[PDB]
Amino acid sequence: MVPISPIETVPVKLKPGMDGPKVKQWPLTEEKIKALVEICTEMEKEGKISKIGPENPYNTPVFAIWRKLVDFRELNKRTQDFWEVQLGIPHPAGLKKKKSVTVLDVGDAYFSVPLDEDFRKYTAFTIPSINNETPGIRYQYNVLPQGWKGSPAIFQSSMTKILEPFAAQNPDIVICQYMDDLYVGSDLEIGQHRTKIEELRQHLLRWGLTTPDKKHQKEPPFLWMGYELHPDKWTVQPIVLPEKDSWTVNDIQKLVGKLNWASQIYPGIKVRQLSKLLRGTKALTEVIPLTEEAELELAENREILKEPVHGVYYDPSKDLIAEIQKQGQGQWTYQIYQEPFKNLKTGKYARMRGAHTNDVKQLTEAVQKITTESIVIWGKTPKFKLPIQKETWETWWTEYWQATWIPEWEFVNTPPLVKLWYQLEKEPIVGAETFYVDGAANRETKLGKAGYVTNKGRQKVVPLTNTTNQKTELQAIYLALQDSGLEVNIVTDSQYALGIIQAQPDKSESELVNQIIEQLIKKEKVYLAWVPAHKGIGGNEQVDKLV
Amino acid sequence: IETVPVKLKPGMDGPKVKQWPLTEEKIKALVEICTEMEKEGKISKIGPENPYNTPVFAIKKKDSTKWRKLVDFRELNKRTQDFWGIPHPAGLKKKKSVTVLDVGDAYFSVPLDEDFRKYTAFTIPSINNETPGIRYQYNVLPQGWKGSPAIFQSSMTKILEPFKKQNPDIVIYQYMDDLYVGSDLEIGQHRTKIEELRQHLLRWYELHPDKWTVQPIVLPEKDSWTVNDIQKLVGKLNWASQIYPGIKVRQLSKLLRGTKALTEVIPLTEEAELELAENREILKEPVHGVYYDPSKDLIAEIQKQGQGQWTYQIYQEPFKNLKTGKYARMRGAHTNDVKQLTEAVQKITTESIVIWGKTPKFKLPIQKETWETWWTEYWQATWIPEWEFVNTPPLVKLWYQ
Ligand SMILES: Cc1c(Oc2ccccc2OCCn2ccc(=O)[nH]c2=O)cc(N(C)C(=O)CF)c2ccc(C#N)cc12
């Protein structure tokens, strides 16, 4: 016999203060007991388990579905935390094309990784006796049991330590671990590739681990995690949009799942209205009627999802490019690619929940998201193509009160273009009329007034019902914008309105803010000045609107 | 040569912080660095039985092309038991000049407590989540951990004993991996003395706090005032009255009576001139009842003033500023707001370390996603302060300009 190299064991403990499991075994039928006795006898003959005495006070229930199945949920609750087997799923767009990709089945190694001796006693389980007239058979595991909390991580670390020297001394290949399967890709000749595959089977055999000499069942195209992986391209598994007369909540969640999933390669997917219907429902069986906007959106989706679209694999010798387009209603879409017309992947970004916003902030957020995703998938920031003029971005970030930055980018003339819709003056305007505005409201009756007085003697006070102080301050500014020329100076004491306007929004929840924005767009020059309230600043008329 | 027993605070588990993504160049640099450190026994690979994690990344300090390894020990420093202390040198900020030295390498010669090493676990990530990452733990005192200067303190005193006995006029302070050396000599004599100290430590950043002062509130001096000038003056005085009690604005607001055009010149009445002069005299005095409390957090607020200019205020209570300053330095960041902000945060943190011996909590005028996306690209210090994000434009910005 050739001496097998022993696999180092991982020291495992229970959670602090807790103790091993002690769960009562369910009574089983005679045939199930016989089946489990045969199975456990074979497994003991192979070395996976060992018989134990009565001194072991721990027990874990056993079932047969035959097939033996141990319910380790209690021991899992009582087992220490392990490092994650994965910090995320790989993305097909990050894979680098290979001439050859072989799959090796290392499933038989799963029961070949020994368990920490001091921890084996916690894996005890009992086979009941026929008619319960003898003591049940007592067993404990000697290897990583299937279903135990720590089996995948310990198996993966053990396999990694075994593969480490083979991977080191063969840098011209790539070895990847996924569950009980290895994936070895290389650009060598098919003969050299198969040769090094045999070498890997040898190196794994030096630990007693057996890879089947049979041809593996997996073969192109690889179906994995909703993905199709081809020798030269990738895509998502076929997305079919159902044809439903009426749509329930679970049908809309299935549809938004299929559209969010398809959006990573199919460019132009929109999910705003369909997901908007799910707003505050929390009822899985509720049938919700379908707005016309969701019909147009869904029709555009069926048009985009008509014929298949594929993504290419990553080539590190070529630059990484990401182009962004605005879709409206806070929706943005982007494509990441290295060659024109051949995308690595696509995606979308929806604006965050906010009371006020503008297109430039949203584009910035989208660029940050794309940057993070790109660093995850490819380890580098792409060069951006953005629908915004250079001068626009310079004006924005130079005049913005916050610090902001976008990485290397270039302008692409693809409407709609992101632009600045208004810009406030830095100094008062000479020759322009000066509108001192003010608004006030009663907290009980919700009655208020909004108006202005100007330097030319122009005045206005409007009464309002069902209003608040903030609403009357905004309404006052709006009135000044309505009745003034193309150039106007505006004086207010509303820290609220100045806080809103200094954020430079172009869209808002409040229709009043939107009306103010529409007024600011039509103006040539607007200077907005703030003063403290109730300080006797003449012109500022808190008493005129408190009547 | 002997390990000191280190534990965590009662009821607190070790840090389990997610590692953020890194570029391929930083990953390769960390691979080289960590391989070399593993050869030197400073770190060791760990198995899956270690669930703890602390983020790691790589930087490039000033005047150097070599990559450096930074560990974000903020969570571990929080969860590490309090070590005991030395009163902060109140004379370090009063000294004419101070030089900062990186003494982090000395920490690697002292072993780390056996049972505590598992809490220093860190992960080199893999591109596209190929593997769960290359996992390491520290065997010696790691740079960035708060326990490293506390444990090495006795050894540091033993090394600096001859130099401190030779120059009683030089003040020496230690914070994290940095040694602050303050004196009053000439720049050349200070540099030769710094080389003397670095070769003194070998065998075992010009900073001038004297050119820094607190900034008073100033009012404009004009011969002719417009309505807008007076409105802004009244606004600024009204703001300052929250800081200074006797600020009075009724005689200046008396001029704003009537609905006049903003650009119209208004002459000052004598009552207005007198009120303005009294306000100047009041603003010439310091703030009443401004004290430091070591049991409270330091809050640092930063305002972007444009054209590479930034203002900042360090306080503990509102309107009770302990420090105010204006960072307008241009250092290869003329087109990058975030780099300027990051350098500003580093300089303010350094000043706060010199003055009070601890870092402040920043209120950054930047969106969370932008800052968290880019701040590690321009970070050069071995420590990291805490920060929050300001989403509403503050009105007081121009009152600090
Ligand atoms: C085929 C495959 C993976 O592919 C590669 C494995 C090794 C090297 C390079 C590779 O991709 C290069 C691009 N490429 C792709 C396909 C092709 O045919 N030809 C190619 O050149 C990577 C995986 N993942 C995500 C892993 O984590 C593996 F552990 C897989 C996971 C599950 C299944 C199934 N069922 C298949 C996987």
**CATH number for the domain that contains residue A529:** 3.30.420.10
Q: What is the CA radius of gyration of chain A?
A: 34
Distances (CA, A) of A339 to A121, A317, B54: 59, 12, 38
Interchain CB contacts (distance < 8 Å): A and B? 188
The pair phi, psi for residue B138, each rounded to 5°, is -85, 140
Domain that includes residue A13, residue range: 1-85+111-151
- CB spacing of A156 vs B48 below 8 angstroms: yes
Q: Are residues A524 and A449 in the same domain?
A: yes
A493 annotated ligand-binding residue: yes
Tokens of A486: 């193309």
Tokens of A248: 């329930």
Ligand 1, residues A101, A104, A181: which to mutate, most atoms within 8 A of Cβ? Answer: A101
Partner A, chain B 4-23, Cβ-Cβ below 8 Å = 18-19, 21-23
Question: Tokens 């980018």 label which residue?
Answer: A409
Q: Which of A421, A449, A475 is the last residue of a domain?
A: A421
Tell whether A88 is within 8 A of chain B (Cβ): yes
The edge-to-edge listing of strands for the beta sheet with B386-389 is: B320-327, B309-317, B299-306, B361-364, B386-389
> For residue B190, with 0-12 CB atoms within 10 Å meaning exposed, 13-18 middle and 19 or more buried, which class applies?
buried
Tell whether B341 is within 8 A of chain A (Cβ): yes
Of B21, B364, B397, the CB nearest to A401: B397
Partner B, chain A 217-256, Cβ-Cβ below 8 Å = none
DSSP assigned state of B137: E
Q: Which residues contact B92 (CB under 8 A, 6 or more apart)?
A: B98, B171, B173, B180, B182, B209, B354
Q: Are residues A373 and A409 in the same domain?
A: yes
Longest dimension (CA), chain A: 109
Cα gap B37→B90, rounded to integer Å: 38
Give how far B48 is from chain A: nearest CA, Å: 5
Ligand 1, residues A229, A314, A345: which to mutate, most atoms within 8 A of Cβ? Answer: A229
In this structure, the dihedral spanned by the alpha carbons of residues A274, A275, A276 and A280, taken in order and rounded to 10 degrees, is 130
CB-based contact A124:A213 (threshold 8 Å): no
For residue A369, the chain B residues in CB contact (below 8 A) are 369
* Residue A213 exposure: Cα atoms within 13 Å on the Cβ side: 2
Tell whether A6 is within 8 A of chain B (Cβ): no
The CATH number that applies at residue A128 is 3.10.10.10
Q: Name every protein residue with a CB atom under 6 angstroms from any ligand 1 atom.
A: A 90, 95-98, 101, 174, 176-178, 183, 185, 218, 220, 222, 224, 229-231, 313
Q: Are residues A426 and A416 in the same domain?
A: no
CB-based contact B318:B325 (threshold 8 Å): no
Tell whether A165 is within 8 A of chain B (Cβ): no
- CB spacing of B135 vs A428 below 8 angstroms: no
Cis peptide before A221 (omega within 30 of 0): yes
Cα gap A203→B256, rounded to integer Å: 90
Distance from first CA to last CA of chain B, Å, rounded?
A: 55
For residue A150, the chain B residues in CB contact (below 8 A) are 48
For residue B232, the chain A residues in CB contact (below 8 A) are 529
Q: Which residues contact A80 (CB under 8 A, 6 or more apart)?
A: A12, A13, A14, A15, A150, B49, B51
Q: Which residues contact A28 (CB under 8 A, 6 or more apart)?
A: A36, A63, A64, A128
Query: What element of type H or E holds A301?
Result: helix A292-304
Q: Are residues A100 and A214 in the same domain?
A: yes
Q: Helix A359-378 vs helix A390-399: angle between axes, to the nearest 10 degrees?
A: 100
- CB spacing of B250 vs A535 below 8 angstroms: yes
Cα gap B297→B358, rounded to integer Å: 9
Query: What element of type H or E holds A501?
Result: helix A495-501
The edge-to-edge listing of strands for the beta sheet with A100-105 is: A100-105, A181-186, A173-178
For residue B304, the chain A residues in CB contact (below 8 A) are 401-403
Q: Which residues contact B395 (CB under 8 A, 6 or more apart)?
A: A495, A498, A499, A530
Cα gap A50→B154, rounded to integer Å: 55
Q: Are residues A408 and A264 in the same domain?
A: no
* Experimental method reported for this structure: X-ray
Cα gap B379→B62, rounded to integer Å: 10
Q: Are residues A242 and A293 in the same domain?
A: yes
The three-state secondary structure class of A399 is helix
Q: Which of A314, A336, A365 is the last residue of a domain?
A: A314
Tell whether A332 is within 8 A of chain B (Cβ): no
Q: Are residues A36 and A96 in the same domain?
A: no
Question: Tokens 């000479």 label which residue?
Answer: A430
Residue B230: closest CA among A454, A539, A474, A526: A539
CB < 8 Å & 24+ apart, contacts of A211-214: A211/A104, A211/A105, A211/A106, A212/A105
Q: Which residues contact B377 (CB under 8 A, 6 or more apart)?
A: B339
DSSP assigned state of A504: -
∠ Cα B131 B135 B141 (to 5°): 160
The pair phi, psi for residue A222, each rounded to 5°, is -75, 125
Strand A525-530 to A487-492 pairing: parallel
Mutate one of B25, B50, B259 to test the A interface: name it (highest A CB count within 10 A).
Answer: B259
The CATH number that applies at residue A104 is 3.30.70.270
Task: Show the beta-strand stretches assigned E in A206-318.
Answer: 222-224, 227-229, 234-236
Cα gap B140→B3, rounded to integer Å: 9
Cα gap A344→A311, rounded to integer Å: 5
Q: How far is the CA of A183 from the centre of ligand 1 (A)?
A: 6
Of B47, B235, B366, the CB nearest to A530: B235
* DSSP codes joined into one string, B211-272: G-----------SSEEHHHHHHHHHHHHHHTTTSTT---HHHHTTT-S---TT-EEPPPHHH
CB-based contact A335:A343 (threshold 8 Å): yes
Query: What element of type H or E holds B164?
Result: helix B153-166
Q: Are residues A428 and A543 in the same domain?
A: yes
Of B49, B304, B392, the CB nearest to A82: B49
Q: Give me the sign of the Cα torsion angle B239, B245, B247, B250.
A: positive
DSSP assigned state of B46: -
Task: Show the beta-strand stretches assigned E in B27-130.
Answer: 43-45, 56-59, 68-71, 97-102, 122-124
Tell whether B395 is within 8 A of chain A (Cβ): yes
Q: Which residues contact A298 (CB under 8 A, 6 or more apart)?
A: A241, A255, A274
Q: Are residues A59 and A125 in the same domain?
A: yes
Domains of chain B: 5-90+116-156 (3.10.10.10), 91-115+157-206 (3.30.70.270), 207-292 (3.30.70.270), 293-401 (3.30.70.270)
Q: Are residues A34 and A77 in the same domain?
A: yes
Tell whether A27 is within 8 A of chain B (Cβ): no
Q: Which of A314, A346, A376 is the last residue of a domain?
A: A314
Domain count, chain A: 5
Task: Show the beta-strand stretches assigned E in A131-196.
Answer: 137-141, 173-178, 181-186
- CB spacing of B263 vs A378 below 8 angstroms: no
∠ Cα B95 B101 B103 (to 5°): 135
Q: Looking at chain B, which residue has its C-alpha nearest residue A12?
A: B49
Give how far B172 is from chain A: nearest CA, Å: 36
Where helices occur in A333-400 by DSSP H, the ranges are: 359-378, 390-399
Q: Are residues A201 and A228 in the same domain?
A: no
Partner B, chain A 418-477, Cβ-Cβ below 8 Å = 427-430, 433-434, 436, 453-455, 457
Cα gap B180→B97, rounded to integer Å: 10
The three-state secondary structure class of A473 is helix
Residue A89: closest CA among A261, A239, A211: A261
CA A366 to chain centre: 13
Q: Are residues A284 and A412 in the same domain?
A: no
Q: How far is the CA of A100 from the centre of ligand 1 (A)?
A: 10
Task: Show the beta-strand stretches assigned E in B139-183.
Answer: 171-175, 178-183
CB-based contact A322:A306 (threshold 8 Å): no
* DSSP codes joined into one string, B269-301: PHHHHHHHHHHHHHHHSPPTT----TTS--EEE
